[PDB]
Amino acid sequence: MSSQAWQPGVAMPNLYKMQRMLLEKCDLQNYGDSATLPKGIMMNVAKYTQLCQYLNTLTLAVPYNMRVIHFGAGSDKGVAPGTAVLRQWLPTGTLLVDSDLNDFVSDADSTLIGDCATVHTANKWDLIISDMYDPKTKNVTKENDSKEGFFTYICGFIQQKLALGGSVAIKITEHSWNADLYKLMGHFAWWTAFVTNVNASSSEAFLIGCNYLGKPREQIDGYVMHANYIFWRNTNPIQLSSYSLFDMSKFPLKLRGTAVMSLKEGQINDMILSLLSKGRLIIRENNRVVISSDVLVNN
Amino acid sequence: AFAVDAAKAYKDYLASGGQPITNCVKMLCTHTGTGQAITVTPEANMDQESFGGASCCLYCRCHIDHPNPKGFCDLKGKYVQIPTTCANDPVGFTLKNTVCTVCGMWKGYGCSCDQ
Numbered sequence: 001m002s003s004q005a006w007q008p009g010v011a012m013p014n015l016y017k018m019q020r021m022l023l024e025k026c027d028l029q030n031y032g033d034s035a036t037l038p039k040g041i042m043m044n045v046a047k048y049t050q051l052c053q054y055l056n057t058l059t060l061a062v063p064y065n066m067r068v069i070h071f072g073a074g075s076d077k078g079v080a081p082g083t084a085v086l087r088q089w090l091p092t093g094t095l096l097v098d099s100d101l102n103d104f105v106s107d108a109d110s111t112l113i114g115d116c117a118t119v120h121t122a123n124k125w126d127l128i129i130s131d132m133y134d135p136k137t138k139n140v141t142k143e144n145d146s147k148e149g150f151f152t153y154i155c156g157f158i159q160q161k162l163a164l165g166g167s168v169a170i171k172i173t174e175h176s177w178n179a180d181l182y183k184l185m186g187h188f189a190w191w192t193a194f195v196t197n198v199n200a201s202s203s204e205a206f207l208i209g210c211n212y213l214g215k216p217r218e219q220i221d222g223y224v225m226h227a228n229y230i231f232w233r234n235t236n237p238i239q240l241s242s243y244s245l246f247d248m249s250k251f252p253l254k255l256r257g258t259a260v261m262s263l264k265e266g267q268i269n270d271m272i273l274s275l276l277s278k279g280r281l282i283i284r285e286n287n288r289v290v291i292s293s294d295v296l297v298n299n
Numbered sequence: 300a301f302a303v304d305a306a307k308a309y310k311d312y313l314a315s316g317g318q319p320i321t322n323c324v325k326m327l328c329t330h331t332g333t334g335q336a337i338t339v340t341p342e343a344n345m346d347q348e349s350f351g352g353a354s355c356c357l358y359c360r361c362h363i364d365h366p367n368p369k370g371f372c373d374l375k376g377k378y379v380q381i382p383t384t385c386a387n388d389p390v391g392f393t394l395k396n397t398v399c400t401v402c403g404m405w406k407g408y409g410c411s412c413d414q
């Protein structure tokens with residue numbers, strides 16, 4: 001019905017990001033409703049498809065031999081639907097690694113099983129996707145404070161292992177959020193909170209940071225920004241829609257061939273920071289991709 | 300000399316009225332693809348559905364070794380095209396059918412080499 005029902009989802013408008021709201025409870029109008037999925041399509045396939053459809057509109061850096069890591073890729077079904085959508089979306093030959101606490105079968109090039117804090121990589125990454133979520137986090141009886149857990153790992157992983165010019169998409173909800181992650185969005189050339197039209201009845205969103213700069217371009221109070229996000233969701237009902245799932249002719253991520261360079265910190269200048277902000281440069285080593293998971297040994 | 304044979308066990312389980320393996324990951328696509336059996340991206344035509352390969356492999360789903368030296372999997376990391384009439388049991392279809400080495404279509408479901 002509404003004009004955005006034909007879009008893959010809705011991004012948080014800029015004016016809501018500039019407010020100073022206090023944190024309120026999230027009360028969605030269309031809460032409890034569900035979108036009508038195409039026959040036989042899982043919710044997570046539809047959700048990831050609309051996420052990738054929206055990422056197609058941004059200035060993602062897409063180099064040759066791209067490296068993507070996907071946290072929280074397992075489901076209670078033992079398979080990885082989000083990884084399958086990512087592998088369809090990403091160019092052929094893209095190295096895709098996924099991980100989850102519980103065992104699962106996936107189409108990724110390599111899979112690590114265990115808590116994300118046990119995951120270590122020698123190389124940097126061009127794109128980080130996280131669907132990590134703890135269902136015990138939704139507790140409406142207690143105060144809604146900033147959460148640690150895997151969010152503490154994700155913040156450190158981005159600052160250490162995300163290449164300059166890379167991007168992220170981290171799943172959050174009303175209660176599953178972290179103030180430092182919002183603050184880290186100010187280290188990208190651009191950021192938003194994206195709600196898929198297929199899951200618009202949920203407080204879930206994907207925090208998207210576009211083109212990592214490795215330095216704060218803008219100072220963001222994480223506690224205030226999450227309150228701004230909830231205020232947007234509370235006052236902007238989003239109509240559930242699966243319309244964008246029916247047109248996949250333009251789905252694959254475009255082969256841009258973004259240049260990869262290995263640079264020292266001092267070499268970064270405004271001209272290169274401009275190339276990073278436009279998605280026309282990735283800064284990282286081009287060595288081999290090596291990963292590992294720490295194993296605690298006990299009786 | 301002993302080796303577990305899950306392929307025959309799944310065929311017998313299906314013949315005795317067992318419910319097929321579920322939660323195979325079906326993909327969204329244009330359904331205007333080449334129609335080949337196993338591809339790097341979804342290639343279903345109007346008569347097919349495209350699935351994530353690993354979710355349609357009996358040996359992947361059952362957490363058992365693949366029946367060949369090196370233990371290599373044909374489907375993991377790729378996408379398998381299943382005829383829509385058989386999309387209710389993708390694991391059974393990939394088990395029972397074979398891909399033509401010439402054209403890449405399912406033998407009996409697209410391959411027209413011996414016609």
Ligand SMILES: C[S@@+](CC[C@H](N)C(=O)[O-])C[C@H]1O[C@@H](n2cnc3c(N)ncnc32)[C@H](O)[C@@H]1O
Pocket residue numbers: 044071072073074075076080081082083099100101102114115116117131132133134149150
């Ligand atoms: C909402 S499910 C994601 C499902 C999957 N992405 C899909 O496409 O269906 C969230 C996943 O994050 C995982 N998870 C939660 N906490 C984690 C942690 N601390 N470390 C690693 N994985 C975690 C859970 O195992 C769960 O499978």
Ligand SMILES: [Cl-]
Pocket residue numbers: 219220221222224225
């Ligand atoms: Cl702020």
Ligand SMILES: [Zn+2]
Pocket residue numbers: 353356357358359360365372373374375
């Ligand atoms: Zn397999």
Ligand SMILES: [Zn+2]
Pocket residue numbers: 399400401402403404410411412
């Ligand atoms: Zn043939």
